[PDB]
Design a protein around this ligand. Structure first.
Ligand code: SF4
Ligand SMILES: [Zn+2]
Ligand SMILES: [Zn+2]
Lengths: 714, 98, 149
């Protein structure tokens, strides 16, 4: 299937493409031709990947100099595996068409914990542990000692990789993570480091955001080599939250105590090092005078001089002083306090800690800790986190804020206070990506309206188009139910949350919808506490028992183990004729991680508009700062955060292969024009005024009729 | 299982067929039905479900794997058509023997 | 306030946390109810150590670490010296070399004998007090006032 696109001719593996695919390809080609960053939305969970990859490959063939390589990022490794599968299929199709191999390379990066071949680190699954063990095995000290070949466990894979892969790079091919593990085992090399080197000469590289956003690890692999590369973020509508998380650092009392203990161990190790080997490790002082990774981005990062901290004892005392200041500032009991610049000024005044020497604290920590030949960085990780916070605060506070919480939420009195350093704008941390890369395409599904995104992230978009899925059959028939059998408002307001009548309306709607809907249904609440209250009310009444009789019921919990077990049983229930009703939370990690396909989550129920609690002070900074700068109304941003989350958690049923399914929102709030307008275009256009505010019974009847229509073949 | 018990001793030449008029989408069974699907395929018993007001996934896989056809009632008139169509003998496939 | 209690009288530290540490030349934890007990007898003597104090050597502090108390007080005194701004020296190394010497002086004063430090500080006094100490001392108020607003 060769498509004569306006720009050029583009190959395509599958037989047919919908008109929305034509629109997507033409808009994407327009953006690439303009060579300017832009944002676009496409409904389908699958199909967008293949269309995007095919268009990018064809554009690379036409203008190889224009685009050096493609950097395609996905939320999670299980998801990016499907992307690499799609890319492998596309490459096989193109190779068959051409009749011969071409110099094209495509690979996926992942954590050493996810992929590795060392038996010692295999049993351990905790990421910091894998990082520390690998650092110990690959340490420059361990490398030098391996040169001596003394009796000590040395990781042969990295040494063999240094010997061979340095000389010879991999010719070409596509390697999934699992297949790359096998390749590393066969060749006695690192599946991780081999891909890391291939990044220098790779046409396509795929990895999650935290490999491309956080300055600590993103920069090293996203160096200026890709000066003009097509960087693409997929389903990255929750990009602001992750970009903020890449900067926010949380300091707790337990973490601070662990830091103090680690610092004591550091002092003891320094004394032992002084008595054992002093001159050779003191040479570090000379190289320092000449002049865990830094959290400072490219331009913000500075390397002039370490500062007044030039020796191990001096640096240790500096950390002692700063840790004492943080300890006392956290121990203070008072209302939540915000102080972005005042915190730095007060630190400098109270404990005599100048911001310039504080700036290089984390970098000097890395160097000095390397000198100590520690067993691993896992033990001292809390100290490195505190150092990253210490350097960040001295680095900048213009678009940041230090929040102190002596008392935690959900606890009238708790002896574990927490100090947050949550950011307020993601533009600060995502600026390097936009500036360095010629164009970035934020391709997303279920995207809340694009107009806000340029305001939140400071960039000038080239194209702003919303693509609506078009099929010969109406795959999706969304509806909103606001009126119950009692013709009573069913809004899940904070003041209306306690309403037993509203809870009863929700329970009856779920009962009837489970009675009619086929096997497999997922209901998303607004919070764990609200879900528990509704479940308890239904349990006190007889509605819950009737729901249990009609279909099996499963519930989500904060604990990941129970969540995984419940979802595993839910899948089997969906396969069998019992069916299942999975209650979950919109913010729950399960909602974002899981993907619902044919005969999975057939009818997506949304109980109440997803709104975060109006007491969490972090969102207060994040929101009022957005009001002050970029001029976004607080209500506007709050409703945007609700609609984007709802679209994220309701857009799964249309994953791909044209699998029918209905999305019912049991809240009259969605019927409001603002919510409908902010809803994604593809869902909204299907939505109509006739079914906008159906009663519970009317919604059930129309759902039954729509399921009848979708049951029959094409 | 009852149908299989009765049809197991039936002659090989005759075509053993089952038409499940499914009404309630739920299926509470003592044992997993996917295992029974294997025995049904081994015994070459055609099973063609006719669902009512539901596109049941387990019955969809049952029908397509066992060789039967799956349908859902659009209305009473279409129900008449479905059953009248099922009246006629089904074509013999490769697994079928005479 | 998180400390288990005073080495001698660990009752207030449990009943109420209002008491705050009192810094001394001994770099030595003390509590007000215990400061009265020191005033009654000795009048400026550490109970266990017996370190003499001119007038009670008492000042309010809220840092549980006595080493941090001593280090912070010594740094407060030292900052009065070597307060010249960085831009006064065009040399790249000299920006932080003098700060290195300053912190070395602080660590020296914390534990080792301070006689050499005092003699050196007299030497730096004779030169700095003329221009640099006065100028930076006067400019401290200006810069602090501008920074506060
Ligand atoms: S050096 Fe390679 S093989 Fe050894 S632990 Fe690290 S990633 Fe695994
Ligand atoms: Zn006392
Ligand atoms: Zn004492």
């Amino acid at each position: 299937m060769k498509l004569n696109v306006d720009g050029l001719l583009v190959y395509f593996p599958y037989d047919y493409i919908y008109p929305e695919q034509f629109s997507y390809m033409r808009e994407l080609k327009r953006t690439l031709d303009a060579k300017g960053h832009g944002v676009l939305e496409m409904p389908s969970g699958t199909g967008k990947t293949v269309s995007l990859l095919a268009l990018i490959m064809a554009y690379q063939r036409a203008y190889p100099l224009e685009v050096t390589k493609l950097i395609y990022c996905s939320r999670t490794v299980p998801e990016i595996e499907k992307v690499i599968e799609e890319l492998r299929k596309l490459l096989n199709f193109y190779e068959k068409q051409e009749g011969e191999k071409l110099p094209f390379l495509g690979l996926a990066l992942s954590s050493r914990k996810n992929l590795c071949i060392h038996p010692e680190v295999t049993p351990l699954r905790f990421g910091k542990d894998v990082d520390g063990k690998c650092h110990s095995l690959t340490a420059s000290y361990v490398r030098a000692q391996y040169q001596h070949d003394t009796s000590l466990p040395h990781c042969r894979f990295y040494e063999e990789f240094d010997a061979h892969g340095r000389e010879v790079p991999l010719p070409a091919g596509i390697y999934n993570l699992d297949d790359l593990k096998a390749l590393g085992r066969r060749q006695g090399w690192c599946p991780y480091f081999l891909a890391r080197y291939s990044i220098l000469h790779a046409n396509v590289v795929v990895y999650s955001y935290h490999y491309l956003l956080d300055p600590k690890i993103a920069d090293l692999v996203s160096k200026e080599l890709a000066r003009k590369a097509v960087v693409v973020f997929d389903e990255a509508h929750n990009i602001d939250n992750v970009c903020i998380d890449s900067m926010s650092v949380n300091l707790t009392r337990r973490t601070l105590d662990r830091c103090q203990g680690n610092l004591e161990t550091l002092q003891k190790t320094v004394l032992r090092i002084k008595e054992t080997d002093e001159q050779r490790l003191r040479d570090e002082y000379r190289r320092l005078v000449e002049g865990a990774n830094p959290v400072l981005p490219d331009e913000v990062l500075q390397e002039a001089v370490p500062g007044s901290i030039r020796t191990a004892e001096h640096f240790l005392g500096f950390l002692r002083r700063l840790l004492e200041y943080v300890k006392w500032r956290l121990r203070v009991q008072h209302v939540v306090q915000e102080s972005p610049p005042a915190f730095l000024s007060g630190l400098a005044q109270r404990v005599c800690i100048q911001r310039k020497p504080l700036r290089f604290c984390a970098e000097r920590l890395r160097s000095l800790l390397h000198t100590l030949e520690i067993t691993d960085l896992a033990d001292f990780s809390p100290l490195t986190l505190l150092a990253n916070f210490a350097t960040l605060v001295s680095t900048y506070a213009k678009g940041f804020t230090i929040i102190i919480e002596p008392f935690d939420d959900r606890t009238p009195t708790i002896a574990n206070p927490i100090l947050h350093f949550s950011c307020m704008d993601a533009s600060l941390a995502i600026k390097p990506v936009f500036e360095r890369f010629q164009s970035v395409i934020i391709t997303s599904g279920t995207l809340s309206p694009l107009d806000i995104y340029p305001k939140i992230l400071d960039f000038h978009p080239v194209t702003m188009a919303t693509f609506t899925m078009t099929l010969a059959r109406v795959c999706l028939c969304p509806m909103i139910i606001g009126r119950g059998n009692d013709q009573v408002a069913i809004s899940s307001k904070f003041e209306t949350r306690e309403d037993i009548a509203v809870i009863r309306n929700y329970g009856n709607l779920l009962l009837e919808m489970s009675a009619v809907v086929p096997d497999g249904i997922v209901a998303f609440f607004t919070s764990y506490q609200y879900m528990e209250s509704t479940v308890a009310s239904w349990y006190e009444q007889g509605i819950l028992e009737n729901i249990q009789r009609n279909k099996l019921l499963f519930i989500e919990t904060q604990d990941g183990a129970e969540t995984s077990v419940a979802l595993e049983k839910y899948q089997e229930a969906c396969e069998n004729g019992r069916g299942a009703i999975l209650l979950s939370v919109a913010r729950g990690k399960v909602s974002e991680g899981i993907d619902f396909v044919h005969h999975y989550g057939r009818a997506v129920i949304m109980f109440g508009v997803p709104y975060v609690y109006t007491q969490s002070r972090i969102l207060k900074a994040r929101l009022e700062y957005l009001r002050d700068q970029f001029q976004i109304r607080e209500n506007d941003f709050l409703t945007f955060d609700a609609m984007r989350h709802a679209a994220q958690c309701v857009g799964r049923a249309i994953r791909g292969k044209t699998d029918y399914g209905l999305m019912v929102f049991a809240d009259k709030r969605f019927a409001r024009g603002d919510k409908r307008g902010k809803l994604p275009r593809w869902i909204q256009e299907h939505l109509t005024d006739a079914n906008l505010n159906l009663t519970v019974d009317e919604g059930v009847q129309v759902a039954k009729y729509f399921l009848r229509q979708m049951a029959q073949p094409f | 299982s009852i149908a299989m018990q009765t049809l197991k001793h039936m002659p090989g030449h005759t075509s053993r067929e089952v038409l499940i008029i499914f009404s309630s989408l739920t299926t509470c069974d003592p044992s997993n039905i996917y295992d029974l699907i294997k025995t049904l395929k081994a015994a070459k018993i055609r099973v063609s479900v006719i669902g009512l007001s539901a596109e049941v996934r387990v019955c969809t896989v049952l029908a397509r794997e066992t060789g039967g056809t799956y349908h859902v009632i659009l209305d009473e008139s279409h129900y008449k058509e479905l059953l009248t169509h099922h009246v006629s003998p089904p074509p013999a496939s490769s697994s079928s023997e005479c | 306030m998180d400390d288990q209690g005073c080495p001698r009288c660990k009752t207030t530290k449990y009943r109420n946390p209002s008491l705050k540490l009192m810094v001394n030349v001994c770099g030595h934890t003390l509590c007000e109810s215990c400061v009265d007990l020191l005033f009654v007898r000795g009048a400026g003597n550490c109970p266990e150590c017996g370190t003499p104090l001119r007038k009670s050597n008492f000042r309010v502090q809220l840092f549980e670490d006595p080493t941090v108390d001593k280090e912070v007080e010594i740094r407060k005194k030292v900052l009065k010296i070597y307060n010249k701004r960085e831009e006064d020296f065009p040399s790249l190394r000299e920006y932080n070399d003098f700060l290195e010497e300053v912190e070395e002086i602080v660590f020296n004063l914390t534990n080792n004998v301070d006689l050499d430090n005092t003699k050196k500080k007299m030497e730096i006094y004779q030169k700095e007090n003329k221009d640099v100490i006065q100028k930076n001392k006067l400019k401290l108020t200006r810069e602090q006032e501008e920074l506060e607003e």
